[PDB]
């Protein structure tokens with residue numbers, strides 16, 4: 112029987128290989144062993160996003176946020192998901208929140224969050 116962390120790493124490896132259903136199933140098996148780890152839900156939300164399953168991706172972001180309200184990644188993926196759903200105002204607020212949390216936690220993602228914010232703001236404007 113593999114451990115929860117072994118399953119998270121197998122899921123990450125599968126994600127790098129673009130095997131999204133397989134990766135989501137590994138994160139699900141990690142959750143079965145330990146359902147109190149926010150990053151398992153955040154990682155699976157990204158799989159759901161790659162599989163275009165937006166309602167499932169939102170639900171995993173919410174499960175991650177309930178365990179870790181300070182999650183930079185859960186707010187970032189929530190915002191990206193909302194952007195694809197055309198919920199622009201909500202997307203921008205979550206991306207801005209990921210930016211502020213990353214700055215407070217002294218995390219370095221280069222121009223990842225400002226770039227995502229610019230895409231969302233341009234998409235919101237183009238629709239207006």
Ligand SMILES: CNC(=O)C[C@H](NC(=O)[C@@H]1CCC[C@H]1NC(=O)c1n[nH]c2c1CCCC2)c1ccccc1OC
Nearest residue numbers: 122123124126127154155157183184187209220223224
């Ligand atoms: C944004 N893309 C991912 O989070 C994919 C994820 N990458 C990581 O965990 C990177 C390894 C070390 C550094 C880390 N970077 C980030 O966390 C990251 N970068 N820009 C941002 C963030 C977080 C949110 C704001 C923008 C990943 C990689 C391999 C396999 C699976 C897997 O995730 C399921």
